[PDB]
Amino acid sequence: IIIATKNGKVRGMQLTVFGGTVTAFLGIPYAQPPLGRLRFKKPQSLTKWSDIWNATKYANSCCQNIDQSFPGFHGSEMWNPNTDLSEDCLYLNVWIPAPKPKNATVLIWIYGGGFQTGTSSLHVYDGKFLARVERVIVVSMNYRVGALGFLALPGNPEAPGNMGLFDQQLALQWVQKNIAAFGGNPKSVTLFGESAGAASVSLHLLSPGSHSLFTRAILQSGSFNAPWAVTSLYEARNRTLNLAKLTGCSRENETEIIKCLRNKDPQEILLNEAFVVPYGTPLSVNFGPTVDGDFLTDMPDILLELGQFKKTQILVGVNKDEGTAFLVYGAPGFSKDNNSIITRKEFQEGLKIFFPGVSEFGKESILFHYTDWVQRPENYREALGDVVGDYNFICPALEFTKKFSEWGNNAFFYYFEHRSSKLPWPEWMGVMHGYEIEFVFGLPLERRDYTKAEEILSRSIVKRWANFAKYGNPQETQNQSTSWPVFKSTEQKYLTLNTESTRIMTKLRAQQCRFWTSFFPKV
Numbered sequence: 217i218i219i220a221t222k223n224g225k226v227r228g229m230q231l232t233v234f235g236g237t238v239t240a241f242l243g244i245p246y247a248q249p250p251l252g253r254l255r256f257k258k259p260q261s262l263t264k265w266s267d268i269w270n271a272t273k274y275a276n277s278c279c280q281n282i283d284q285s286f287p288g289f290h291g292s293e294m295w296n297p298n299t300d301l302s303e304d305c306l307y308l309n310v311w312i313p314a315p316k317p318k319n320a321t322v323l324i325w326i327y328g329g330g331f332q333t334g335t336s337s338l339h340v341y342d343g344k345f346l347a348r349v350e351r352v353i354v355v356s357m358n359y360r361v362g363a364l365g366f367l368a369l370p371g372n373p374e375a376p377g378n379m380g381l382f383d384q385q386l387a388l389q390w391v392q393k394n395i396a397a398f399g400g401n402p403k404s405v406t407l408f409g410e411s412a413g414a415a416s417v418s419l420h421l422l423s424p425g426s427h428s429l430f431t432r433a434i435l436q437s438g439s440f441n442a443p444w445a446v447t448s449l450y451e452a453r454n455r456t457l458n459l460a461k462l463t464g465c466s467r468e469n470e471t472e473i474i475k476c477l478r479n480k481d482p483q484e485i486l487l488n489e490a491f492v493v494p495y496g497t498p499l500s501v502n503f504g505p506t507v508d509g510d511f512l513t514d515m516p517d518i519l520l521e522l523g524q525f526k527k528t529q530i531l532v533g534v535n536k537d538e539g540t541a542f543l544v545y546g547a548p549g550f551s552k553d554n555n556s557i558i559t560r561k562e563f564q565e566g567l568k569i570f571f572p573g574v575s576e577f578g579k580e581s582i583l584f585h586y587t588d589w590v591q592r593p594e595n596y597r598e599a600l601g602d603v604v605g606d607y608n609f610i611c612p613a614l615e616f617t618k619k620f621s622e623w624g625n626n627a628f629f630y631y632f633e634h635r636s637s638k639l640p641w642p643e644w645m646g647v648m649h650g651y652e653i654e655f656v657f658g659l660p661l662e663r664r665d666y667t668k669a670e671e672i673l674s675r676s677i678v679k680r681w682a683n684f685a686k687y688g689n690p691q692e693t694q695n696q697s698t699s700w701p702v703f704k705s706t707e708q709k710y711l712t713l714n715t716e717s718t719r720i721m722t723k724l725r726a727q728q729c730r731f732w733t734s735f736f737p738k739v
């Protein structure tokens with residue numbers, strides 16, 4: 217199975233899936249390897265080749281630090297790279313239904329990982345179930361992360377910032393220019409991603425250069441207005457400079473700083489990324505998106521508020537316990553191996569861990585808002601998790617959706633509350649950040665693994681996501697399902713996703729978000 221693309225021929229492989237077949241092209245290059253003088257620069261166009269490029273295995277993952285907090289534990293290791301790390305990592309994957317489709321809608325996945333980690337080859341991102349079951353084409357790309365992907369010297373093409381976002385953009389262009397040859401419709405492309413991947417999707421909604429590269433968008437647990445999503449020009453300068461010093465690259469000429477950094481080995485750069493910030497948190501994004509004046513022309517909050525974004529439909533959602541996952545990466549008294557009952561003192565120490573540069577008054581205000589107990593030994597444990605989840609994910613996703621829908625477009629919001637029967641993390645962590653992904657990709661449809669109720673749930677989510685991509689409406693129209701209403705600034709209706717009963721509810725976390733969205737930004 218050979219497909220002719222603009223830059224050359226590529227050969228795929230046949231996969232058997234649910235008594236059917238899917239053709240996969242894993243590892244197609246979409247840009248010039250960003251090595252040597254190209255390190256830290258925007259991705260460059262790829263020169264044609266002849267011969268047949270074999271896209272039969274996942275390519276290298278981009279350089280990045282790995283989570284070594286729990287060696288041998290599947291809960292954490294399932295997110296680590298499963299392919300060799302390398303600066304030569306600008307590749308993408310394509311899964312297409314078989315027989316070849318005639319004008320299939322295209323879903324483009326952008327992985328998360330705090331803009332410091334991640335890769336498109338993870339098992340939970342395998343696009344073969346969606347291609348098989350919904351007959352859509354699935355594309356996913358690797359983009360640069362960490363300093364190699366986001367180091368910034370605003371204005372300087374040697375390291376302008378947002379390089380990883382331009383990698384994503386160049387892959388979207390590849391789809392525009394080449395997907396028809398695979399039987400895809402470039403006029404029906406939906407971006408979807410989770411966490412930093414969702415934040416990325418939201419930035420493409422803001423970037424004029426990405427406007428014509430896609431049709432609709434799905435944001436799972438993330439948006440650019442989240443507090444960890446955009447690095448300020450101030451922080452970025454201090455960070456690029458701290459990295460320079462830590463690697464012996466400080467120099468009067470900034471362009472000389474970059475030349476020096478280009479001689480360091482990826483490992484010396486990775487090793488020092490951690491220390492570029494005086495005091496970080498388990499949610500630190502040392503090197504992330506910045507207002508570079510190219511991909512992003514102004515502070516995103518201003519663009520959102522003033523309606524400067526691509527006008528189209530959006531599907532946005534969050535999980536019930538977004539914050540718990542981070543508590544075991546630094547909050548005192550927490551452990552994935554016991555019930556983590558903490559005390560008021562520990563809760564207070566926890567706030568210090570998650571809100572390092574916050575005034576004492578700021579922290580007390582968080583404590584006052586979350587400790588008006590409705591006794592229960594797990595009050596403080598549960599409160600710190602909600603504090604972290606509301607501030608970092610839920611409230612920002614809700615504000616993004618409200619502000620976006622005020623300009624006229626249909627928006628749909630979900631609250632995912634099902635805890636995987638297979639979750640390796642303890643029960644107290646609940647419906648964790650990242651654990652809706654396997655349902656969206658259809659892993660529970662594979663019986664060889666999950667309960668019957670999960671197969672059904674995953675089946676409905678898959679259908680709703682596909683209907684959103686193809687038709688701009690996330691409904692499951694055949695099995696007497698709850699209709700998903702549009703989210704409007706007034707009523708604020710949202711759909712809950714679970715195995716029990718799906719319900720229409722209103723004003724998710726109203727009281728908590730008024731605190732984070734209106735008040736807290738002032739302290």
Ligand SMILES: *[C@@H]1O[C@H](CO[C@@H]2O[C@@H](C)[C@@H](O)[C@@H](O)[C@@H]2O)[C@@H](O[C@@H]2O[C@H](CO)[C@@H](O)[C@H](O)[C@H]2NC(C)=O)[C@H](O)[C@H]1NC(C)=O
Pocket residue numbers: 451454458459461462491492493494
């Ligand atoms: C901007 O960076 C300075 C410098 O950071 C230090 O040096 C870097 C190379 C790196 O190794 C960091 O870990 C160091 O902290 C920050 O200033 C530091 O502030 C802390 C406060 O706790 C102090 O203990 C250090 O001595 C200071 N570093 C020095 C030697 O001046 C500064 O905090 C950063 N600016 C911001 C955003 O606050």
Ligand SMILES: *[C@@H]1O[C@H](CO[C@@H]2O[C@@H](C)[C@@H](O)[C@@H](O)[C@@H]2O)[C@@H](O[C@@H]2O[C@H](CO)[C@@H](O)[C@H](O)[C@H]2NC(C)=O)[C@H](O)[C@H]1NC(C)=O
Pocket residue numbers: 547548549550551553554555556557
């Ligand atoms: C839950 O465990 C934490 C973490 O302790 C580590 O992991 C445990 C499972 C066990 O193997 C310990 O020996 C490990 O050190 C406990 O938190 C520690 O508590 C002690 C005393 O309160 C304190 O001195 C340490 O600083 C704490 N460590 C951390 C990371 O906070 C916690 O007490 C346990 N809670 C329970 C059993 O409910």
Ligand SMILES: *[C@@H]1O[C@H](CO)[C@@H](O)[C@H](O)[C@H]1NC(C)=O
Pocket residue numbers: 268269270
């Ligand atoms: C690509 O795959 C074909 C068929 O498997 C093989 O003949 C060819 O040598 C491969 N090209 C390489 C390894 O460069």
Ligand SMILES: *[C@@H]1O[C@H](CO)[C@@H](O)[C@H](O)[C@H]1NC(C)=O
Pocket residue numbers: 318319401403404
């Ligand atoms: C695919 O459908 C689009 C409309 O969405 C149409 O413009 C295009 O011509 C179709 N592509 C094919 C099958 O040629």
Ligand SMILES: *[C@@H]1O[C@H](CO)[C@@H](O)[C@H](O)[C@H]1NC(C)=O
Pocket residue numbers: 675676679692694695
């Ligand atoms: C609808 O119901 C049928 C049979 O009752 C079931 O097999 C199928 O998975 C359901 N389809 C969706 C999209 O949930």
Ligand SMILES: [Cl-]
Pocket residue numbers: 293296
């Ligand atoms: Cl490992």
Ligand SMILES: [Cl-]
Pocket residue numbers: 696697698717718
């Ligand atoms: Cl239902």
